[PDB]
Design a protein around this ligand. Structure first.
Ligand SMILES: NC(=O)N[C@@H](O)C(=O)O
Ligand SMILES: NC(=O)N[C@@H](O)C(=O)O
Ligand SMILES: [Mn+2]
Ligand SMILES: [Mn+2]
Ligand SMILES: [Mn+2]
Ligand SMILES: [Mn+2]
Lengths: 423, 423
């Protein structure tokens, strides 16, 4: 039967993971690969070549989402889609996102070796970017596929990176958005245009490893939000301005960072998280009192309302701190505040069947990280396959998933794609 | 007499201040000009051109201290020296340092127009750098002039900037330190090689302005120190690492910054200051928990012992915070910890006499900022002339001293140089 015939080239997949990690602005073992940069362009070509070698028909949309299709026996039907991203935040690992892209191509190669003949077409999606590094916008590609008019409008009119390079200029530099007359609405997919969407991904947590399980069947994705905060003071000479006359924007930021921690812990749930991953002082000189501070805050919960309470408290603390410190709260912006998504019940059932037929132990579990799957769920039934990762590490170079774990995930992906294709 | 004949080109001096401010990595009205960068080189050339126009013998030492001498009638005597710096910390003003360099050149021209005949030679010094911006080392030039073997060794062996450019490579890109067999001891001046050293400088405080006085005669310089601190944690994924398992280096840094403020305030003296001017997070991504944080701390007091107590407490707090946060205190480095200095009493005498002869009001006062004068005081009798500045502002673009105030400082400098030269 099909399950018993599935064979992955595990060392070969690992070789591709290692090769792709070479396209990086950080020295190995770290990876940095930001949307539309030269390293991103080289990684795209590498992946598109693999898609072509796998016999896929390759196309790209206006923002550089890349699609590789294996035409089915009934090609007019909504296809079964799978994929992930290949961008990497500064000094991160080689497996986040990449496993679900290279592993999806390997799943196609695995199904072909087994002589599987899809009824519904299978389509692999390389999402143009999932990480918010360049423009502050996470899942830029999938948010657009899911039809966000507000994002399309923003990308055309206002969005720039930290070097004031516009989204359009950056996209065009990479070979995309070459139609001046496109409001980017051309990227939008109709609801139901895919029968289902699957994403293979490392767990980014220690659960599967700690429990000794092979596969996680994802049931939902937690609700993510991000905030940008700026404080402004008078600054001046660190040696000469006596303490009673100061309004130190850096100390306001320090206090807000600690308040973020406090409000997260106030939720009384271990599922609530909040982080200050960016805190910048201006002018940023040892002997200059900071006159501006900038914080970027990530906060999430499986419960949307509980997360929103944290956000409201953070805003209250930012105002209280500004008044006490005598600084201006010059910016408090909610960059995104998104709902959680539920995986489709029939997709979950097929994934769990797949794991069982492959003799792979599994559990149903929630994803704490967000993924392109979060937005694809607005377009079609969605599910995710988690594989174990070492100590749960992710977003750091110690991130690791074994060749066998990756192959197990690929086999589950192949078998779930096959079940959905032959609905 | 000499005093009544002194005449400054006030608008011309202002014009040169404005021109020099154009050599900047920050857009007007802010100035950024860092040691050995292209902007620094351009500004050095501008000043050397002015020195040559004033008829001075111009020479440079191995690190780029620039000397401009007017030969006296008795040239073998130790010369009377004056000068300042022209480097500028990020987003600062146009007057800090620059007034005492361009004003020193104007003082020579003032004396020449009056037909002054020096006995002792007069020498203007453009110190290669006073600001710690590039290498974390303040007064790099004058520390070397004052014979710091420890500094000379570090500069040749370990010192690099934040882009990992070595001191030697940076120096060489600007045309300095080209001799491979110089251990930089060639820069050292013998004690007593100058008869005296004077620095004209904006007050960087509101005292002269608030009291309606023309000139500050500086009697002492406060004791400066700086610390470099790093915390190390595990970092990881901002969404997936639950709060109980974190060791957030960013929150360690936040807590240490607030502790700095606390320990400064505990001194019970208004003369004590401390600042966290630099606080950086690594990797510095919104969705990555900081695994490293870096603080640069400035702390000073007129009383050295009180200053040292703040430092000891800051180090105790850093260890306590590291243990509580479960992070590693991976670096705690006292970059410098320098004693205060006293101005020479006969230099003070001549300066106060000069101000009175020019019908200028004056008061005795302390410098809270540090200056090259702090280290020149190790080589020779030292003094400083303060001029008033708007609202006391410094290290920001609102920094301002009027053409008349600068001219007053120049005349006091001219007359004080003349008294010292003829002594
Ligand atoms: N899968 C994943 O790590 N997405 C992240 O970029 C995130 O912050 O959730
Ligand atoms: N004069 C002066 O401002 N020196 C400064 O750079 C300082 O921090 O003291
Ligand atoms: Mn990620
Ligand atoms: Mn990912
Ligand atoms: Mn300064
Ligand atoms: Mn200065």
């Amino acid at each position: 039967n099909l399950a018993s015939s599935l064979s992955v080239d595990a060392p070969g997949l690992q070789n591709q993971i290692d090769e792709l990690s070479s396209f990086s602005d950080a020295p190995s073992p770290s990876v940095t690969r930001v949307l539309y940069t030269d390293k991103d362009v080289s990684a795209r070509r590498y992946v598109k070549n693999l898609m072509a070698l796998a016999g896929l028909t390759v196309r790209e949309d206006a923002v550089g989402n890349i699609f590789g299709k294996w035409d089915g026996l009934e090609p007019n039907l909504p296809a079964v889609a799978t994929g992930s991203h290949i961008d990497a935040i500064p000094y991160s690992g080689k497996y986040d996102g990449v496993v679900g892209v290279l592993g999806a191509i390997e799943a196609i190669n695995v199904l072909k070796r087994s002589g599987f003949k899809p009824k519904r077409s299978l389509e692999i999606i390389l999402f143009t970017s999932a990480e918010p590094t360049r423009f502050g916008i996470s899942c830029l590609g999938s948010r657009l596929l899911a039809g966000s008019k507000e994002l399309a409008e923003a990308l055309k009119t206002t969005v720039v990176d930290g070097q004031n390079v516009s989204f359009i200029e950056a996209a065009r530099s990479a070979g995309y958005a070459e139609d001046k007359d496109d409001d980017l609405s051309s990227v939008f997919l109709k609801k139901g245009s895919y029968f289902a969407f699957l994403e293979l991904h490392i767990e980014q947590g220690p659960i599967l490893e700690d429990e000794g399980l092979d596969i996680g069947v994802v049931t939902a994705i937690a609700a993510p939000a991000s905030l940008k905060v700026e404080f402004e003071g008078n600054g001046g000479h660190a040696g000469a301005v006596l303490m009673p006359y100061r309004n130190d924007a850096g100390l306001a930021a320090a206090e807000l960072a600690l308040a973020v921690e406090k409000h997260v812990l106030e939720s009384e749930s271990i599922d609530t998280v909040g982080t200050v991953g960016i805190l910048e002082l201006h002018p940023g000189a040892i002997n200059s009192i900071p006159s501006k501070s900038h914080l970027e805050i990530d906060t999430r919960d499986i419960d949307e309302a509980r997360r929103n309470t944290v956000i409201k408290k953070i805003q209250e603390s930012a105002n209280t701190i500004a008044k006490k410190r005598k600084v201006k709260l010059s910016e408090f912006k909610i960059v995104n505040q998104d709902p959680p998504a539920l995986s489709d019940k029939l997709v979950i059932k097929k994934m769990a069947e797949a794991a069982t037929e492959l003799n792979l132990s599994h559990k149903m579990m929630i994803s704490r990280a967000y993924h392109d799957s979060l937005f694809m769920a607005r377009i079609s039934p969605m599910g995710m396959i988690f594989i174990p990762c070492y100590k749960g590490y992710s977003h750091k170079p110690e991130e690791y998933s074994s060749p066998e774990d990756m192959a197990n995930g690929v086999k589950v992906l192949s078998l779930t794609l096959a079940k959905l294709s032959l609905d």
